[PDB]
Write a protein that binds this ligand. Structure first.
Ligand SMILES: Nc1cnc2n[nH]cc2c1
Length: 165
């Protein structure tokens, strides 16, 4: 199971870790991807997870988009987890660098409540442009299921833990 996590609340845990490396080690039932509406896994967590699947995640995603069209900002879809997890929950947090409504971050986190336990990154953090301290606050106040947060950057991890109310 998950190891080396700091408990933040009854159901939220956090660790300074590469989510690709965490997923390969634990092989969780669900790994969350920081997806965009087109499931174009170019950079950030999405690019890293996709590269770990040898592009199989992108091939599957393109077939999903061809059939279903794009996701909504705040929405999600469950696809295969490939070599990383049983499933990948592709969740679209608002991208602040695209002028997307930050209030959609709570809607994005609500998707996590459909899964008993998840390995996840902070939604809308990193290249999505939102304040990661705000993302962690929305996470703890929205997610009721067990969420194991992987924060890649050590310096951001320390800031998140030390400022956690
Ligand atoms: N917050 C995270 C977690 N794992 C990551 N792997 N590559 C980029 C990442 C960002």
């Amino acid at each position: 199971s998950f190891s080396g996590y700091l408990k933040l609340t009854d159901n939220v845990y956090i660790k300074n870790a590469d989510i690709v490396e965490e997923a390969k080690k634990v092989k969780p039932t669900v790994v969350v991807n920081a997806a965009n509406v087109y499931l174009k896994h170019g950079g950030g967590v999405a690019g890293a997870l996709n590269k770990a699947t040898n592009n199989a995640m992108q091939v599957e995603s393109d077939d999903y988009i061809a059939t279903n069209g794009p996701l909504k900002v705040g929405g999600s879809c469950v696809l295969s987890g490939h070599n990383l997890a049983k499933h990948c929950l592709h969740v679209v947090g608002p991208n602040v660098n695209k002028g997307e409504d930050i209030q959609l971050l709570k809607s994005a986190y609500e998707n996590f409540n459909q899964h008993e336990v998840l390995l996840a990154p902070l939604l809308s953090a990193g290249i999505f442009g939102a304040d990661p301290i705000h993302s962690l606050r929305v996470c703890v106040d929205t997610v009721r299921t067990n969420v194991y947060l992987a924060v890649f950057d050590k310096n951001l991890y320390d800031k998140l833990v030390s400022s956690f109310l």
